[PDB]
Amino acid sequence: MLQPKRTKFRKMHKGRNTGLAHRGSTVAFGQFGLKSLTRGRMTARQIEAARRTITRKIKRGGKIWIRVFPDKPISNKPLEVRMGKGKGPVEYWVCEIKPGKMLYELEGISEELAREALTLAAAKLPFKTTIVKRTIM
Amino acid sequence: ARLKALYNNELKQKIKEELGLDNVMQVPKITKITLNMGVGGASQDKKLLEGAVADMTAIAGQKPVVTKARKSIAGFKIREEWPIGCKVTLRGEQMYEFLDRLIAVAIPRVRDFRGFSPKAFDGRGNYSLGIKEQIVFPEVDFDKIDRIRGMDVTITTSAATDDEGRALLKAFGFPFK
Amino acid sequence: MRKDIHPDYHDVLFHDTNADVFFLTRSTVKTKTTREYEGSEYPYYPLDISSASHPASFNKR
Amino acid sequence: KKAARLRRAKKTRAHIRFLGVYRLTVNRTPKHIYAQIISPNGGEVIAQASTLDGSLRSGATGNADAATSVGQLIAERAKAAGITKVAFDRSGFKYHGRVKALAEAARENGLEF
Amino acid sequence: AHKKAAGSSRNGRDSNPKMLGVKIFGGQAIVAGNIIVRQRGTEFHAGAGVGMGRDHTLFALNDGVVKFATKGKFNRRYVMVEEA
Amino acid sequence: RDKIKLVSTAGTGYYYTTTKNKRTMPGKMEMKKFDPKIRQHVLFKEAKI
RNA sequence: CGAAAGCUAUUUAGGUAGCGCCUCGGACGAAUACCAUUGGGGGUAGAGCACUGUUUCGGC
RNA sequence: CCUCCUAAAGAGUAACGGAGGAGUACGAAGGUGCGCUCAGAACGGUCGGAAAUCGUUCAUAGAGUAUAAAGGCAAAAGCGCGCUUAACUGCGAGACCCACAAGUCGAGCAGGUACGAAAGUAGGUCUUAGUGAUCCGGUGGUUCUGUAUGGAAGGGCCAU
RNA sequence: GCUGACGACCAUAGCACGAUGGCACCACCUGAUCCCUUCCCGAACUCAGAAGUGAAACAUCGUCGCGCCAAUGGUAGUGUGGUUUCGACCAUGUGAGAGUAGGUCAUCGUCAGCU
RNA sequence: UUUUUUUUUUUUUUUUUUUUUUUUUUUUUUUUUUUUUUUUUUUUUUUUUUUUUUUUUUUUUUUUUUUUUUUUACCA
RNA sequence: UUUUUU
RNA sequence: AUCGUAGUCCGGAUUGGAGUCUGCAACUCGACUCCAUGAAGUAGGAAUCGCUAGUAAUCGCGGAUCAGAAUGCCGCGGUGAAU
């Protein structure tokens, strides 16, 4: 369950997820990556589930990199609470994902098994995903 | 000062020949000598500082100045602008006379004095030595004394290099090793 | 040198009596006696030591 | 140190330039002393007098008397260059000694500041 | 209110506006006394022809045309009043 | 800080008014203020407001 | 001919008042609007890590 | 009431929106002239260390700024010393802001000064918070009025 | 040709490294009687001077190691009109930042002095 | 929930003003006693709930959480 | 005045 | 005669060095000697002990055990109280 360490502000404005991922759109650490084709919020629970799936499939023989970190606190109002009376409490942490973003990379393992590990991880994620190899340019 | 008149005639040329310097403005010289006394336990009694100032006055032959706390530290129980030390700076004739006196009379009076460390230069030709008992200076008398105090003697020289600084110090007769 | 704020500073004839070597040097000391050097009579200060005087078993038994 | 001297000259230089008056800038060295009158723009010298002048070049320059002669001479040059009211610029030197002597000679020989 | 979530965090304060900023822009005619910049600190510095008040207000010392320029060794923004 | 009058010593009845910490300044203050009734700077002495 | 449902204040909040917006009369007459060319200041969208933080991997 | 954000690069702009402060302080912590430069790190040095004071070398500020924050700050607006009372009186061209009532900045002019050798600078403080109308009553002044007249009372005007 | 004073400009002007400069100038430098300095100190400030040296500083010259500047093209954004599956797209007008190629060891003005 | 009250030695209670930790009961060792009580001598003993924060220094000043008490949680 | 127990 | 109230010319533990004896053998683990060091200790809380006269208090001297190894034990005399 990733989460920032001490932060500067408890709560944040909603914001707008718009545009393409021109940064973080390249397999830069491993040889092999799972890239997002759609935009959304990558919850820390989803990050942890797709990391546990990948690790269980690669079996301490390869290396995994996570390029998404949940640094955006998301608040929620509790049930039976009227509108107003301040902003709700923080309940979970998301990362804003744009189309093109790497989410995980794998290195040091067979291409077939890395493909199926990333395919298993994509099933836990709220994104249409594609699987990409690391290129030179 | 006899040591200044000796350095201007013999020691300067000897140092030049020793270090192999091609210009007379390259040979080192002592610029100043600073005597310090950390009396950090003051600002609670402020009589220890009186005695330290008197001892510095008698030792150096020059009225010293009380040095305040530049910052506030709780561990030492000191607040800003609190008098926590004493210092005097000697230049020219006064420093040459003081250093001649220190080398001749006072430095043999250090109890169990084998020598002074040659690696005590800061790395730019300046030397610093500690005197654990201020009674090695004959100016202070054993009859009237507050307590046993110590003192830093920092010799700030014009040398830019460790070896030049120690060659200049040793040309005066400094007890090294 | 600011006027009349510094201690008395006068020439003193330190003398290491062990090697009998003199050191003429201005100092703040006030000696009780005064001994004449080649010049005038300076306040004389005797010195016990100065820079001139300071510096198998089985087989035997 | 020239850096420190120019650091302590800058306040006066900028205030004189705000006032927008002709300024009498001095500059002394352990050998010579110079004085020149700068326009309010700041980049035109319209009168000068130093100890490099042939009248006092071969003489005991680097003196209060040489500063007095230089002040007396720049007062005359400013007088016959149209300048009567200046603002004195000690250039970070203490207003004392050679600089004071030059300023008093200039002030007594026609320039009024 | 089932999950004990909604609670006290009291911050509904804010000061009144101060109406700062550039009043007369570059190239405009200006008469002496007209305020050019209201600012906090010297975001702009007074060059020739403009003075500065105790609250760092820049105002015209004389009639002319307002000029903005970056100048000096600190790359400071300067406002001038040129006699145009 | 308590309020106090500084009253002119010229007998014009003119005063200035100011505040004072009467634990750090426990004695009557006296400054040289301009008196507009005599058009002169005179000594204004502290008084009870 | 032709609004407003705004701002400010209010024992005010569905009332009222000044200002804004409507109308009529008078004064003034291009001082107004649009566009072209042109003089300005900016810290937004975007972007970025130089500061304040935050973050992953490797070396150390 | 002040600072930041919301606030969409002029201003302004709401919510029981997200974050913090104020209801003071100071006769020097004001004016002026003069002078100075910080924090940290490393090295050397009696007690004395991670850190006191001393010396050296790097060091646009990573400090300080009476205080919250922002914006500023080397001509320092930061830090010392001498002398001082401009934390003056009468005002004020002209502007900002603004429903009004208010609020803000201000060169210049007259008088009296303080500092400076002088040109000069000074109408409080780096700025933006530290505040409360009118009525009523008190006080220090004032020839303005003064119910037949002279006074007085009371009222007005200026300050508080 | 060089030096100094004051400016324009404020990194393509800076930093770093190396070389050259002492006839003028500048800088160290000598001394501390006098003027004036030090909460102590002739360190700095100041004065009176030329025995020495260009060591340091400074000035100039050299370079691309760092800094700094920096296209073209593309991309992002964006005003207006239209469409839209609300991601965006089309027409038109604008057009970054980052990065790349590349550039840079400044350029000028007034005055004085030595040559 | 909300508003107040607070949380400190073994326990139960005192502080506090930014410059420090307290009685009492214990507990440990002595001593009196045939031996235990009682009693008398000695001692030891505090992340001052935690966590950010301010300050040179905080148990103390701010903020959060967490136990504790209370007091409220109403109209259809 | 205040001596509990085994 | 000196010290003149001091942690000292008091106190003599502990430690460093060098030795002598006894003994096959002195490291664990002997006793003395010499030189150097010079620790606590300035009269001792609650409490508690012995002593009624040659006693207490104090001062030395012997012996048993024993190759060596008493501040213990067993004795001896000297001075000598207070109540």
Side-chain angles (χ1 to χ4, degrees), chain A, chain B residues 1-35 37-42 46-76 78 80-177, chain C residues 1-29 33 35-40 42-61, chain D residues 2-113, chain E residues 1-3 5-84, chain F residues 1-21 24-49:
Chain A
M1 194 72 132
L2 302 179
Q3 185 184 342
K5 258 168 164 77
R6 45 154 281 121
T7 195
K8 187 175 319 184
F9 296 108
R10 289 192 318 140
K11 291 131 172 224
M12 222 69 40
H13 282 169
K14 191 188 271 101
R16 299 291 122 100
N17 181 356
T18 69
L20 297 181
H22 301 285
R23 293 293 290 285
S25 99
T26 226
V27 189
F29 283 123
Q31 292 310 131
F32 198 39
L34 174 83
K35 154 187 290 191
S36 209
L37 296 168
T38 61
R39 83 177 66 251
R41 286 176 175 178
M42 172 95 82
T43 246
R45 281 168 186 280
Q46 299 155 2
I47 303 161
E48 163 83 353
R51 183 214 70 86
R52 302 219 280 236
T53 302
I54 287 168
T55 285
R56 223 196 280 106
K57 204 61 178 157
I58 56 132
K59 271 126 184 163
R60 77 165 269 173
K63 185 143 190 3
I64 177 188
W65 285 270
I66 319 183
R67 313 266 307 266
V68 306
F69 188 83
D71 71 309
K72 192 183 162 56
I74 300 305
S75 67
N76 223 69
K77 279 197 156 355
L79 299 182
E80 315 154 357
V81 178
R82 286 223 169 81
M83 302 267 99
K85 300 152 153 245
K87 182 165 191 277
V90 187
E91 322 278 44
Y92 54 105
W93 298 78
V94 303
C95 182
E96 298 266 62
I97 304 310
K98 301 182 179 182
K101 186 77 175 83
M102 320 323 319
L103 319 173
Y104 304 88
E105 289 131 305
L106 272 51
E107 184 259 20
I109 199 146
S110 147
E111 202 207 54
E112 280 84 322
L113 171 86
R115 269 177 194 284
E116 43 152 308
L118 294 170
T119 285
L120 292 178
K124 321 274 166 177
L125 298 183
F127 302 112
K128 293 181 153 319
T129 41
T130 197
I131 278 194
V132 284
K133 262 157 62 184
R134 150 161 210 180
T135 38
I136 299 166
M137 275 174 27
Chain B
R2 72 115 183 152
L3 266 205
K4 142 105 126 225
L6 160 86
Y7 171 99
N8 289 154
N9 310 330
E10 334 232 80
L11 274 49
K12 191 170 200 105
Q13 308 80 315
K14 149 184 322 179
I15 289 190
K16 220 225 289 183
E17 304 293 323
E18 219 232 300
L19 305 169
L21 305 168
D22 87 282
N23 184 22
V24 96
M25 298 313 276
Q26 302 209 55
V27 359
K29 58 160 175 217
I30 309 161
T31 82
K32 54 174 198 225
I33 277 167
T34 309
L35 319 183
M37 267 175 169
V39 199
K46 231 109 112 171
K47 191 275 303 207
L48 268 233
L49 239 190
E50 300 187 327
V53 173
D55 280 329
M56 202 149 264
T57 299
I59 281 167
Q62 226 197 23
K63 145 176 244 307
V65 114
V66 166
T67 73
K68 313 304 212 349
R70 141 207 175 263
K71 206 74 79 223
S72 266
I73 321 228
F76 308 144
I78 56 191
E80 278 224 55
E81 281 252 76
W82 259 4
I84 64 173
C86 199
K87 109 187 202 210
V88 81
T89 196
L90 318 170
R91 295 187 198 259
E93 223 75 351
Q94 197 92 353
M95 74 146 253
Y96 270 112
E97 291 197 326
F98 167 82
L99 166 133
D100 162 72
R101 206 186 333 131
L102 157 93
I103 279 161
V105 176
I107 221 67
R109 285 154 83 100
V110 167
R111 288 177 336 105
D112 185 45
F113 163 69
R114 305 308 264 110
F116 269 120
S117 160
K119 40 168 316 235
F121 293 86
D122 60 302
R124 302 225 162 59
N126 331 308
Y127 195 67
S128 318
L129 54 127
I131 287 280
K132 274 150 280 323
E133 287 189 324
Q134 37 72 28
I135 84 256
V136 324
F137 298 99
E139 285 85 36
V140 9
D141 50 345
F142 216 59
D143 167 324
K144 351 247 174 31
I145 207 186
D146 251 334
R147 72 212 272 281
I148 267 48
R149 307 213 174 74
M151 200 192 45
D152 313 330
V153 173
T154 316
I155 299 159
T156 313
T157 80
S158 102
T161 281
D162 230 318
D163 261 12
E164 323 183 330
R166 75 151 46 81
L168 154 81
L169 259 203
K170 182 144 30 67
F172 273 109
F174 208 63
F176 260 121
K177 316 310 145 223
Chain C
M1 205 73 70
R2 263 194 225 250
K3 92 175 88 275
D4 65 49
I5 58 137
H6 304 286
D8 181 28
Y9 208 59
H10 55 103
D11 6 30
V12 183
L13 186 41
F14 290 120
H15 168 204
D16 182 315
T17 53
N18 156 280
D20 294 309
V21 309
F22 302 83
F23 290 116
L24 192 34
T25 282
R26 275 201 334 238
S27 164
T28 15
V29 104
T33 148
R35 161 139 91 202
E36 195 232 343
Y37 208 13
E38 79 281 357
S40 66
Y42 302 75
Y44 159 70
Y45 199 93
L47 270 186
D48 71 312
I49 195 173
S50 82
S51 72
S53 22
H54 193 287
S57 323
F58 198 131
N59 289 322
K60 302 125 85 187
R61 47 112 159 301
Chain D
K2 191 150 65 163
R5 211 244 302 156
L6 293 172
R7 203 265 309 149
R8 83 176 82 97
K10 218 94 73 193
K11 171 80 160 114
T12 295
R13 298 268 181 74
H15 181 62
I16 275 168
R17 144 177 56 101
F18 158 79
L19 295 168
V21 293
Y22 295 103
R23 100 169 175 257
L24 165 58
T25 286
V26 310
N27 174 46
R28 71 153 184 68
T29 49
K31 273 240 162 73
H32 299 272
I33 187 160
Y34 318 87
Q36 59 211 125
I37 285 169
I38 322 297
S39 58
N41 155 56
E44 281 72 58
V45 177
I46 56 180
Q48 69 96 15
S50 67
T51 54
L52 308 158
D53 191 68
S55 64
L56 68 163
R57 182 52 160 291
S58 296
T61 172
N63 230 113
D65 306 341
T68 306
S69 325
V70 162
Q72 186 266 330
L73 164 71
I74 190 164
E76 312 303 306
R77 274 151 146 158
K79 266 293 175 271
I83 307 303
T84 61
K85 211 214 172 223
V86 303
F88 190 76
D89 176 36
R90 58 187 174 90
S91 298
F93 300 106
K94 180 164 167 211
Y95 182 73
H96 172 75
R98 266 131 65 64
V99 171
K100 227 181 102 152
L102 189 153
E104 280 143 22
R107 173 151 42 208
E108 190 205 359
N109 290 130
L111 282 171
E112 46 101 10
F113 58 84
Chain E
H2 259 93
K3 218 176 66 164
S8 255
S9 41
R10 212 284 282 195
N11 43 215
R13 281 156 332 268
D14 198 8
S15 72
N16 299 330
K18 286 310 167 290
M19 293 84 165
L20 304 185
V22 177
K23 263 40 170 159
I24 293 169
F25 293 82
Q28 294 197 212
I30 195 168
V31 304
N34 280 12
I35 286 168
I36 315 173
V37 188
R38 304 223 89 151
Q39 54 181 1
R40 297 282 170 261
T42 44
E43 277 164 296
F44 292 87
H45 287 78
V50 357
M52 184 164 87
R54 51 160 316 258
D55 64 334
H56 311 269
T57 303
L58 298 182
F59 58 98
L61 292 171
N62 35 34
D63 295 33
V65 155
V66 154
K67 206 233 172 283
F68 289 84
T70 299
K71 53 206 258 280
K73 105 198 153 183
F74 286 132
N75 279 307
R76 283 150 142 54
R77 298 178 290 186
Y78 272 85
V79 73
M80 275 83 38
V81 171
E82 277 149 2
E83 323 321 314
Chain F
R1 294 172 69 94
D2 61 335
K3 289 158 180 84
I4 46 142
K5 285 165 98 149
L6 281 276
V7 191
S8 47
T9 36
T12 66
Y14 195 80
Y15 59 102
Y16 287 89
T17 222
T18 184
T19 67
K20 174 230 271 214
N21 189 326
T24 84
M25 167 168 354
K28 319 287 179 273
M29 32 186 297
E30 37 167 47
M31 270 167 329
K32 248 176 155 142
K33 321 279 284 200
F34 177 70
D35 196 309
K37 315 291 275 331
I38 51 170
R39 321 251 306 294
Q40 276 156 24
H41 268 72
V42 310
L43 212 83
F44 281 62
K45 287 197 110 223
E46 197 248 36
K48 330 176 108 194
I49 215 164

Short mmCIF file of all heavy atoms in Angstrom, two decimals, chain B residues 139-165:
data_model
loop_
_atom_site.label_atom_id
_atom_site.label_comp_id
_atom_site.label_asym_id
_atom_site.label_seq_id
_atom_site.Cartn_x
_atom_site.Cartn_y
_atom_site.Cartn_z
N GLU B 139 54.31 36.48 33.72
CA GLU B 139 53.59 37.70 34.05
C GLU B 139 52.55 37.46 35.14
O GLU B 139 52.35 38.31 36.02
CB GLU B 139 52.94 38.28 32.80
CG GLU B 139 53.92 38.94 31.86
CD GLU B 139 54.58 37.96 30.92
OE1 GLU B 139 53.91 37.02 30.47
OE2 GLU B 139 55.78 38.14 30.62
N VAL B 140 51.88 36.32 35.11
CA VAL B 140 50.91 35.96 36.13
C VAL B 140 51.64 35.30 37.29
O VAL B 140 52.47 34.40 37.09
CB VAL B 140 49.81 35.04 35.55
CG1 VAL B 140 50.19 34.59 34.15
CG2 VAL B 140 49.54 33.85 36.45
N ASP B 141 51.37 35.77 38.50
CA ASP B 141 52.06 35.28 39.69
C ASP B 141 51.23 34.22 40.40
O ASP B 141 50.00 34.22 40.37
CB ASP B 141 52.35 36.44 40.65
CG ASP B 141 51.14 37.29 40.92
OD1 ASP B 141 50.15 37.18 40.17
OD2 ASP B 141 51.18 38.09 41.88
N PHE B 142 51.94 33.29 41.05
CA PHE B 142 51.28 32.18 41.72
C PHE B 142 50.58 32.58 43.01
O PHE B 142 49.65 31.90 43.44
CB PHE B 142 52.30 31.07 42.02
CG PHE B 142 51.75 29.69 41.88
CD1 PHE B 142 51.21 29.25 40.69
CD2 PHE B 142 51.76 28.81 42.96
CE1 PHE B 142 50.71 27.97 40.56
CE2 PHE B 142 51.26 27.54 42.84
CZ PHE B 142 50.73 27.11 41.64
N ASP B 143 51.02 33.67 43.65
CA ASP B 143 50.41 34.10 44.91
C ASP B 143 48.95 34.48 44.67
O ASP B 143 48.03 33.87 45.24
CB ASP B 143 51.22 35.25 45.51
CG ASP B 143 50.51 36.01 46.65
OD1 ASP B 143 49.28 36.22 46.65
OD2 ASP B 143 51.23 36.41 47.58
N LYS B 144 48.71 35.49 43.85
CA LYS B 144 47.36 35.92 43.53
C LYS B 144 46.91 35.21 42.26
O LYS B 144 47.46 35.44 41.18
CB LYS B 144 47.29 37.44 43.36
CG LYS B 144 48.55 38.17 43.78
CD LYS B 144 48.32 39.03 45.01
CE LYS B 144 49.62 39.63 45.51
NZ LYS B 144 50.56 39.89 44.39
N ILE B 145 45.92 34.33 42.39
CA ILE B 145 45.39 33.60 41.25
C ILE B 145 43.94 33.23 41.53
O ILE B 145 43.58 32.90 42.67
CB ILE B 145 46.25 32.35 40.93
CG1 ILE B 145 46.15 31.99 39.45
CG2 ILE B 145 45.86 31.16 41.79
CD1 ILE B 145 46.85 30.70 39.10
N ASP B 146 43.09 33.35 40.51
CA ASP B 146 41.71 32.92 40.64
C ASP B 146 41.62 31.40 40.57
O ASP B 146 41.10 30.74 41.48
CB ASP B 146 40.86 33.56 39.55
CG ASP B 146 39.92 34.62 40.09
OD1 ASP B 146 39.54 34.52 41.28
OD2 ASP B 146 39.55 35.53 39.33
N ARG B 147 42.14 30.82 39.49
CA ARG B 147 42.19 29.38 39.30
C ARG B 147 43.21 29.10 38.21
O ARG B 147 43.95 29.99 37.78
CB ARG B 147 40.80 28.82 38.96
CG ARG B 147 40.33 29.16 37.56
CD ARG B 147 38.83 29.32 37.49
NE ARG B 147 38.16 28.05 37.24
CZ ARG B 147 38.07 27.47 36.05
NH1 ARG B 147 38.57 28.04 34.97
NH2 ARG B 147 37.45 26.30 35.94
N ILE B 148 43.27 27.85 37.76
CA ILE B 148 44.09 27.48 36.62
C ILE B 148 43.22 27.58 35.37
O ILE B 148 42.16 26.94 35.29
CB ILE B 148 44.70 26.08 36.78
CG1 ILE B 148 46.09 26.15 37.41
CG2 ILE B 148 44.79 25.37 35.44
CD1 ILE B 148 46.19 27.03 38.63
N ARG B 149 43.64 28.40 34.42
CA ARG B 149 42.95 28.59 33.16
C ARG B 149 43.84 28.13 32.02
O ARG B 149 45.03 27.88 32.19
CB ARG B 149 42.57 30.06 32.95
CG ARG B 149 41.80 30.67 34.10
CD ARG B 149 40.82 31.70 33.59
NE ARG B 149 39.97 32.22 34.65
CZ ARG B 149 40.37 33.07 35.59
NH1 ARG B 149 41.61 33.53 35.62
NH2 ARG B 149 39.50 33.47 36.51
N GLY B 150 43.24 28.01 30.84
CA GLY B 150 43.97 27.72 29.63
C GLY B 150 43.75 28.78 28.57
O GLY B 150 43.01 29.75 28.77
N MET B 151 44.40 28.57 27.43
CA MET B 151 44.41 29.59 26.39
C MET B 151 44.79 28.98 25.06
O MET B 151 45.61 28.07 24.99
CB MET B 151 45.37 30.72 26.76
CG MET B 151 45.13 32.03 26.05
SD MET B 151 46.52 33.15 26.30
CE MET B 151 47.87 32.02 26.02
N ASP B 152 44.18 29.49 23.99
CA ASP B 152 44.60 29.17 22.64
C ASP B 152 45.53 30.25 22.12
O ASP B 152 45.25 31.44 22.24
CB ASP B 152 43.41 29.04 21.69
CG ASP B 152 42.31 28.19 22.25
OD1 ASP B 152 42.62 27.27 23.02
OD2 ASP B 152 41.13 28.46 21.93
N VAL B 153 46.63 29.82 21.50
CA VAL B 153 47.55 30.70 20.79
C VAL B 153 47.46 30.28 19.33
O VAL B 153 47.95 29.21 18.96
CB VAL B 153 48.98 30.61 21.31
CG1 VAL B 153 49.92 31.42 20.42
CG2 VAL B 153 49.07 31.07 22.75
N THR B 154 46.80 31.10 18.52
CA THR B 154 46.73 30.87 17.09
C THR B 154 47.71 31.81 16.39
O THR B 154 47.63 33.02 16.56
CB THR B 154 45.31 31.08 16.56
OG1 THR B 154 44.38 30.46 17.45
CG2 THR B 154 45.16 30.47 15.19
N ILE B 155 48.61 31.24 15.62
CA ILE B 155 49.62 31.97 14.87
C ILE B 155 49.16 31.98 13.43
O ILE B 155 49.22 30.96 12.74
CB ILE B 155 51.01 31.34 15.02
CG1 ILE B 155 51.44 31.34 16.48
CG2 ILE B 155 52.02 32.07 14.18
CD1 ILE B 155 52.51 30.33 16.80
N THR B 156 48.65 33.13 12.97
CA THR B 156 48.18 33.28 11.61
C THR B 156 49.30 33.88 10.77
O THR B 156 49.77 34.99 11.05
CB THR B 156 46.94 34.18 11.57
OG1 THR B 156 46.01 33.76 12.58
CG2 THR B 156 46.27 34.11 10.21
N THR B 157 49.74 33.13 9.76
CA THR B 157 50.88 33.46 8.94
C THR B 157 50.43 33.74 7.51
O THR B 157 49.30 33.44 7.11
CB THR B 157 51.91 32.33 8.94
OG1 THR B 157 51.50 31.31 8.02
CG2 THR B 157 52.04 31.73 10.32
N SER B 158 51.34 34.32 6.73
CA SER B 158 51.07 34.62 5.33
C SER B 158 51.32 33.43 4.42
O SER B 158 51.12 33.54 3.21
CB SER B 158 51.94 35.79 4.87
OG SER B 158 53.05 35.33 4.12
N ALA B 159 51.75 32.30 4.97
CA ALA B 159 51.98 31.11 4.17
C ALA B 159 50.67 30.58 3.59
O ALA B 159 49.62 30.64 4.24
CB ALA B 159 52.65 30.02 5.01
N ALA B 160 50.73 30.08 2.36
CA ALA B 160 49.58 29.47 1.72
C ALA B 160 49.61 27.96 1.78
O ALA B 160 48.61 27.32 1.41
CB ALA B 160 49.48 29.92 0.26
N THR B 161 50.71 27.37 2.22
CA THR B 161 50.91 25.93 2.18
C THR B 161 51.41 25.43 3.53
O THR B 161 52.12 26.15 4.26
CB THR B 161 51.88 25.56 1.04
OG1 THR B 161 51.17 25.57 -0.20
CG2 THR B 161 52.51 24.18 1.23
N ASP B 162 51.01 24.20 3.87
CA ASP B 162 51.39 23.58 5.13
C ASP B 162 52.90 23.61 5.34
O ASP B 162 53.38 24.04 6.40
CB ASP B 162 50.89 22.14 5.14
CG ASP B 162 50.14 21.81 6.39
OD1 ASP B 162 50.61 22.22 7.47
OD2 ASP B 162 49.10 21.12 6.30
N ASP B 163 53.67 23.18 4.34
CA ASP B 163 55.11 23.07 4.50
C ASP B 163 55.77 24.43 4.66
O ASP B 163 56.70 24.57 5.46
CB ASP B 163 55.70 22.32 3.31
CG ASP B 163 55.97 20.86 3.61
OD1 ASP B 163 55.49 20.37 4.65
OD2 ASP B 163 56.64 20.20 2.79
N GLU B 164 55.29 25.44 3.93
CA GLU B 164 55.81 26.79 4.12
C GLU B 164 55.51 27.32 5.51
O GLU B 164 56.38 27.95 6.12
CB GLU B 164 55.22 27.73 3.07
CG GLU B 164 55.04 27.11 1.71
CD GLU B 164 54.52 28.09 0.69
OE1 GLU B 164 53.79 29.02 1.08
OE2 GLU B 164 54.85 27.92 -0.50
N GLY B 165 54.31 27.06 6.03
CA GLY B 165 53.99 27.49 7.37
C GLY B 165 54.89 26.90 8.44
O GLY B 165 55.36 27.63 9.32
#
